[PDB]
Amino acid sequence: VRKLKHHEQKLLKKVDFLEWKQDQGHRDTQVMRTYHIQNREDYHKYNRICGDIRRLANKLSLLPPTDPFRRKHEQLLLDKLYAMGVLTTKSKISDLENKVTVSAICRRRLPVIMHRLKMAETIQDAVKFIEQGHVRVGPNLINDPAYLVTRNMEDYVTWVDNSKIKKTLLRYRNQIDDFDFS
Amino acid sequence: TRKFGLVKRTLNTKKDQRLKKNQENLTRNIPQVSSALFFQYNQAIKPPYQVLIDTNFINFSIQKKVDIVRGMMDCLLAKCNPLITDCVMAELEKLGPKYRIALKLARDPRIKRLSCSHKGTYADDCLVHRVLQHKCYIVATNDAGLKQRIRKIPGIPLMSVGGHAYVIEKLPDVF
Amino acid sequence: DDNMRREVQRDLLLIKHRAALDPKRHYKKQRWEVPERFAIGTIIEDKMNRKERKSTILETLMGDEASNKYFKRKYNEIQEKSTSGRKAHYKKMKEMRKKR
Amino acid sequence: GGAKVVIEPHRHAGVYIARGKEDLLVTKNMAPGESVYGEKRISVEEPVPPTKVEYRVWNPFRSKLAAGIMGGLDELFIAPGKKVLYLGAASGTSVSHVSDVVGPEGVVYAVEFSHRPGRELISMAKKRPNIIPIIEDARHPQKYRMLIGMVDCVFADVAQPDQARIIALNSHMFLKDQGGVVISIKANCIDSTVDAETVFAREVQKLREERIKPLEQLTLEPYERDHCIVVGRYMRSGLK
Amino acid sequence: AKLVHDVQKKQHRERSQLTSRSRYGFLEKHKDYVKRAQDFHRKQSTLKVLREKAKERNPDEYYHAMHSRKTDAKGLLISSRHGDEEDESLSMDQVKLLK
Amino acid sequence: SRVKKRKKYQKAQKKLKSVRAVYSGGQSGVYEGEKTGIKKGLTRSVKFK
Amino acid sequence: IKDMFSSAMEVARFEGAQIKTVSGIRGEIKRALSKPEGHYRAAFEDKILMSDIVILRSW
Amino acid sequence: DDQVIGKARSRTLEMRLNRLSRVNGHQDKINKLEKVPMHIRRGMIDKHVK
Amino acid sequence: GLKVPKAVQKELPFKSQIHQMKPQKKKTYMAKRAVVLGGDEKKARSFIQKVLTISKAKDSKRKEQKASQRKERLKKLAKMEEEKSQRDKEKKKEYFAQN
Amino acid sequence: GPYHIKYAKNGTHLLITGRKGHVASMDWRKGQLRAELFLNETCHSATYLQNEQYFAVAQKKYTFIYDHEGTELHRLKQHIEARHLDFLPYHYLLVTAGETGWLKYHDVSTG
Ligand SMILES: [Zn+2]
């Protein structure tokens, strides 16, 4: 705390007031900083789910490699996570242990889908825009940033009609038709 | 009146300077080529030569029974000041009491001795540093590694016990 | 201040581009971006005449005679390599077609 | 002759470069308007009227410290607040340039043995008020032990074959810990019986035996033949 | 050259455009052809890239600089040819002082 | 075979002015300047160890 | 291609041959043209220029 | 195999892969020990040798 | 140069739109106000231009010649590194035949 | 809500902990507040650790450790439902008991 002198640094080597061992390297903080996660327990509520997928893939790999219960359930879990967007491809089954990850479940959120769809400039501005209530999926407006937008359901992320942001991009390309409110 | 996209403030391990990995928040130097050298000649050294010895040169000379000063005079046909640095002497003293013969053959009145000022006793780095510093010495050695270092740097002759007397490599006036 | 930098922005260009001023001089390679603080100075000879002491390096180079000849020659051949095959060439080829 | 140049600072603090179509090394003038050895001066008009302060060219063919500076040394220890002990102030040629590197707030003690160079030193040190001319043999520092105390650097351009012992005496007496030491070695003056790299190695070994840790040497080859400059810091406790 | 004579590696000079066919100037040979073809190929490659982007446009795209940037009647972009560090219309006190 | 070695030595001491900076013989006349530039970033000296 | 043959009978005799320009652009005789007698249509690797000379090497 | 359930299966597979791998792979890199601290690896060894 | 069509470049995304500014047809006020000095100043402008273009052509010539230098020694160094690598992969095999 | 009040070990600083969400570390005899944070869950108790520089709050379930200006430094995965925090200052131990029937000591220096 005072940049210990040399005999002190030798005499108390394990002292660290910020980084502890149970913090696991502050990855809750670090990936919630990356994806701009609002409240604190979302990382760990996703981590329970990654733990459940990895536990099941462990127990399900422990079965013999030939039996159809193993093969069928690994394929069901693999297609389930790929259609949920948590996985990127269903090629190999070691993706169930290596590449399922809280950052994957977070990349599947709604502000991040907004940013990767170019509907905002950054994930903080996407969080601001859907806190301000511009973004609907399908017909109904979505208001919380934690919404998880699956592979089929990211074809329906749009803005609401009558939104000032929809008005300003149409009038940027001066295609604004004021008949249909925007 | 409130801000949007509100977050908790947590410590930023990429950017917080309070923690150990983030504690680290021109003038070029191309050393000039030694004026002693021609292209690869070292036109400046002339007798009496000054020959930096190391430990396996001492051990190989004792195992071959070549004297130090007379073997160097026979090899170069000149005069020689064989020199033992303090790290070479410390390496000989560290080699044990199976080498007491080598130790009291290196403590000789005719063998002069430099005094290196650096921590520890690594003779190969001491010899290489003080030979590429100055380009006025001969390096007498028998290490494969030290021989390859010295014969890669330019203008430094290299003596080595080979056969039953000394041979000399990068000196171009031996006969 | 900028009221001085806009005065001497030209001889600083010549000190930056020294290696083009003379075909026999060939300076060693530095970039020399303009420093933040500098000061223009005039060499005091102790005890070029008074007719040819100037107020810029630029006026000395322009008052020189064979240097202006060298700059005009080198500029004209840089120009006629730069204009070599571009557009007056292309329309002289098209009108060579359309003539006959 | 009458051309215009632009003054720009060097990496070293106190010395400047004068760019034109052939650039000069330049220092400020502590006594403006008069040349100490006939070198050409440069007169800027520093902007209450704008004052004409002026700058003086450091000829490296006539000055070993200029030869070292523009051959390129990493660390001179001569800086604009320093106290320098110049040993072998042959006359005031390089000492004037050292004096106005050092500035008005620092001191240059110019030690010289010969008396007609001493007269030149006093007639220069009147109009450079921070040069203290000391006419005494430098090999006995206990004589002028009463006149100087705790210099920050020691420049040494004596021409003696007991050079390193002279420097060791004056450094142990008057140089502070981690102070600077600059040596000008002239090989053919130390001893012509050996070659120049042998005598450079021997004098550097003598410096590190009198616990001046040598940092750097430079041969200064287009200006002098078989000279050298060794920079060191007086480490006083453990060169290691 | 190892087992090659100097009279073996001679210089085969190249021919010119025919004297009859001289208004289509410079009969071009294979080095001039590859200078033609590879330039057309790189311009087609960047044109294919821009057509790919126009197909993958995603018209719900919102960057904040479409409050300053504006599009003309043809649909293209208006780039203000003076600056965008200076204002185009100078106000009446400014024109008073300049006049 | 002599005028060969007469000229591959004149090439040789012309290449030597590219590696080192060869002692020319001292100052010719009045000191004009550095004539090729002063570089304040580069320091061409041998540091110790 | 304008004149290396004199008639449609000659081009019919030489249909399908491989020609090339002097710039190495390969090509092939496709069909005898109808209206001028010795003219034909050839398809090349890419767009040849007006300044080129097509070539049919034969023995 | 096709009948060996979990922990025997994973360690049988790990054993077989290490045994096949030891022929061509480097001896320094086939058997990496787990990063265990000094005062507890020495303790594990002392109690296991007891 | 590359001429990218109107039907494409009006349908490009916001990041990829081409900033192409139109010429000025009208003699505008600041263009007809602004003053250019003559005589000695026009020969100073011509001189600074001539210096700067000879400097730019000199530097371009020097850098293209340096490219031709290091491409050729790159080729010969590829020959040498392949030679040394081949002697390496034979000496290793000879070492494993001896051991 | 109801404010749990804790002082420092000297009299210099005060640390109040509202039951709804409101924690504040302040100099109570200057007017200097140096942390004020509305952690929207029901906080119970709080203590300083060894200075005014770190303070531990017993939140809805997990105990958190914040630094001087309020940034979160640690989220204790153990200390499942603290209600009572305390600090042993010679021994550098944060002591914790609550709605689990467990008493936990957390060495604060090494972690
Ligand atoms: Zn040593």
Alpha-helix runs per DSSP H in H1-50: 6-21, 27-30, 38-49
- Quick check: J70 and B9 CB within 8 A? yes
- DSSP bridge partners of B168: B159
CB of I51 closer than 8 Å to CB of C17? yes
CA dist list (Å): A54 to A32, A47, A62, A83: 21, 10, 12, 18
CA–CA distance, B145 with B137 (Å, rounded to integer) = 18
Residue J53 backbone phi and psi in degrees, to 5: -90, -25
The tokens for G11 are: 């081009």
For residue I45 the two structure tokens come to 């402008």
Is the CB of residue F36 less than 8 Å away from at least one CB of chain C?
yes
Is there an interface between C and I (3+ Cβ pairs < 8 A)?
yes
Amino acid letter, E35: K
For residues D105 and D108, what is the distance between their CA atoms, to the nearest angstrom? 10
| Beta pairing class for B80-84 and B49-53 | parallel
Contact H10 A65 (CB under 8 A): no
Interface contact F49, partner D, CB < 8 A: no
Residue B136 to residue D195, Cβ atoms within 8 A: yes
B127 three-state secondary structure? helix
State how far the Cα of A96 lies from the Cα of A79, in Å rounded to an integer: 11
CA atoms within a 13 Å half-sphere pointing along the CA-CB vector of C92: 8
Residue keyed to tokens 């199976």: B98
Q: What's the resolution in A?
A: 3.4
Q: Which helix (H) or strand (E) holds D163?
A: helix D163-174
By the 8 A CB rule, do D39 and D63 touch? no
Name A62's Cβ contacts closer than 8 Å, sequence gap at least 6. H5, H6, H7, H9, H10
- The closest alpha carbon to D170, from D184, D199, D149, D200, belongs to D149
Q: Which two tokens stand for residue A169?
A: 């991009």
Report the phi/psi class of residue D236: left, alpha or beta, with left for phi > 0 and alpha for psi in -120 to 50: left
Residue of B28, B35, B133 lying closest to F48 (CB–CB): B133
DSSP-assigned states of every residue in D45-89 = -B--PPB--EEEE--TTS-HHHHHHHH--S-----TT-EEEEE--
- Residue E13's contacts (CB-CB under 8 Å, 6 or more residues apart) are none
Q: In a 3-state reduction of DSSP, which class is residue J21? A: coil
Per residue in E31-58, is it b (16+ CB within 10 Å) or e — as a string?
eebeebeeeeeeeeeeeeebbeebeeee
Using a CB–CB cutoff of 8 Å, tell me whether J109 touches chain B.
Answer: no
Candidates I10, A122, A110; CA nearest to E59 is I10
Q: Which of A16, A17, A20 sits opposite J54 (nearest CB)?
A: A17
What is the C-alpha separation between H29 and H22, in angstroms, rounded? 9
Do residues D184 and D229 lie in contact, with contact meaning Cβ atoms separated by under 8 Å? yes
C14 touches chain I (CB under 8 A): yes
Strands D41-44 and D24-28: unpaired
Among E43, E65, E77, the residue with its CB nearest the CB of I18 is: E77
Q: Does H4 touch chain A (CB under 8 A)?
A: yes
Which residues, 6+ apart, have CB-to-CB distance to A177 below 8 Å? Answer: A170
Rounded distance, CA D47 to CA D44, Å? 9
How many CB atoms neighbour CB H20 within 10 A? 10
Backbone φ and ψ for J25, nearest 5 degrees, come out as: -110, 125
Instruction: Name the token pair of A155.
Output: 């074809």
Query: Is there a contact between G33 and G1 (Cβ–Cβ < 8 Å)?
Result: no
Which of D1, D5, D38 lies closest to C41 in CB terms?
D5
- Assess contact for B64 and B104: CB atoms under 8 A: no
Beta strands at D24-28 and D54-57: parallel, antiparallel or unpaired: antiparallel
Q: Is A131 exposed, middle or buried (0-12, 13-18, 19+ CB in 10 A)?
A: middle
C-alpha D100/C-alpha A92 separation (Å) is 76
Decide if B10 and A38 are in contact by the 8 Å CB cutoff.
Answer: no
CA distances from D181 to D100, D118, D151, D154, J49 (A): 19, 23, 10, 5, 53
Please state the separation of Cα B36 from the chain's center in Å. 19
3-state secondary structure D86-135: EECCCCHHHHHHHHHHHCCCCEEEEEECCHHHHHHHHHHHCCCCCEEEEE
Question: CA-CA distance, E54 to E68, in Å (whole number)?
Answer: 22
Q: Rounded to whole angstroms, how far apart are CA atoms I90 and I83? A: 11
For β-strands A157-159 and A135-137, DSSP reports them as antiparallel
Paired sense of beta strands D83-87 and D107-112, if any = parallel
CA D236, CA B107: separation in Å to the nearest integer? 30
Q: B159, B140 in Cβ contact below 8 A? A: yes
| DSSP assigned state of B21 | G
Task: Report the length, in residues, of chain G.
Answer: 59
C45, D9: Cβ pair inside 8 Å?
Answer: no
Contact residues on chain C for F35, CB-CB shorter than 8 A: 25
Q: Are E15 and G6 in contact (CB under 8 A)?
A: no
Among residues C34, C41, C31, the alpha carbon closest in space to that of C9 is found at: C34
Sheet of B165-168: strand order equals: B80-84, B49-53, B138-140, B158-162, B165-168
Ligand 1 mean position to B84 CA, how many Å?
A: 9
To the nearest whole Å, the CA of E14 is away from the closest chain G CA by 11
In one-letter notation, the amino acid at residue B41 is Y
C-alpha angle B159/B163/B165, rounded to 5°?
55
Phi first, then psi, for residue B169 (nearest 5°) are -110, -60
> Concatenated DSSP letters for B91-121?
HHHHT-GGGHHHHHHHS-SSSB-----SSS-
- Cβ–Cβ contact H40 with A under 8 A: no
Calpha distance B143→C82 (Å, rounded): 62
